[PDB]
DNA sequence: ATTATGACGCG
DNA sequence: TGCGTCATA
């Protein structure tokens, strides 16, 4: 009743760039614009591995993780842009720098949480309050929401997509109570107006298009964002949740796409997020733990409290290289050469980071994978990062892992290494 | 698929 | 103030 929290206290958006690495390459090379194209990493094995795909190429069935040779079978005219290679490895600097362009624009509107290279959460609660005070009970025009979908609408008593979008928006706006500054639906609507403005600024100032979700928390905002891609935004209201969740596979919700989500499905014998409402909080805690159980109990009702963290910069700076099949490092000299390449890239990125962001990493984390281990990581060890010097970091990394070598011969390495990973962490102000 | 980030548990 | 695992981009 009057004491039941509905999780409508915040306005949260998630902005996610459309096919991000592709847009970065299309900005740089106009010949790629408005074409089926993909970004590929390396070239020797099966034409290279695809890591990003334009919407035109997706129509042919091209996907991330596909080898380029196989993608060409589906889309013979597919254009390809290669990730830069430096010091023997893929180097992602262009995309990291493009990400900074977008994050800096978003930060003008509100505090953001960098969630990945191409997406950020925004807590718009305060910005919405401010905008509502300027509006002064003035209605919100559909013209202020030219790319917004209202999930669940139209409904009740045109066969084209834009027509449906407008119909739903009209129904939503007609029902809005602009009189009440505390109305959560109104708050979301104003949030959506702000997000249109943010998205326009991103496109004007960078050339890049994006999609966004607007809702009352991060999980719903992330879900919302994916409902209408690309180049569109979606408002998921609290009232839209029962219908939305009634046919929503559990795996679609952030954090439930893996083993936990599979366990929810198997243990409870359900398929859709909505079906979770039929269990008590204690029942859910009994299967999935105190924390997960409480989270699921609220989440299936559209309620989540995880804050948008005030963090625009990554907390770690890392680089890594796999050594597949035949290339597994079987000599000490090889292990040392690659550790040096990684350390040189790391030194370059750290030195730039220190100058830009007034901070210094204090810990170096070294991780390896050994041949035969199905685990993505076989071993992790750390040491002090006291100087931004590639030679010192590579030597320190070796020292930390050299004991992993079973080889009797001092020159050889066994068992061969299938991966090396160096990561700088534990930043302190400088 | 390879090269990344970030959270959480304490087999 | 370590390390392994999970989940995601
Ligand atoms: N598994 C991966 N390995 C390497 N790079 C990845 C991987 N997943 C994503 N990326 C990179 C390339 C992407 O352009 C960028 C952002 O990823 P993501 O948001 O998942 O898709 P996207 O931006 O390419 O398309 P979409 O329009 O569907 O968001 O990060
Ligand atoms: Ca994206
Ligand atoms: Mg993304």
Strand order of the largest sheet: 7-8-1-10-11-9
CATH superfamily of the largest domain: Reverse transcriptase/Diguanylate cyclase domain
Q: Tell me the helix content.
A: 25-40%
Distinct helical segment count:
14
Number of strands: 16
CATH class of the largest domain: Alpha Beta
Estimate what percentage of residues fall within beta strands.
15-25%
Q: What overall geometry do the principal axes of the alpha carbons give? A: globular
Bound molecules: 2'-deoxyadenosine 5'-triphosphate, calcium ion, magnesium ion
Count of discrete structural domains: 4
Q: Which CATH-level-2 architecture of the largest domain? A: 2-Layer Sandwich
Report the structural category.
Answer: alpha+beta
CATH topology of the largest domain: Alpha-Beta Plaits
Profile the largest sheet.
6 strands, mixed
Subcellular location: Nucleus
Binding site for Mn(2+) 1: 16-17, 118
Binding site for Mn(2+) 2: 16, 118-119
Organism: Homo sapiens
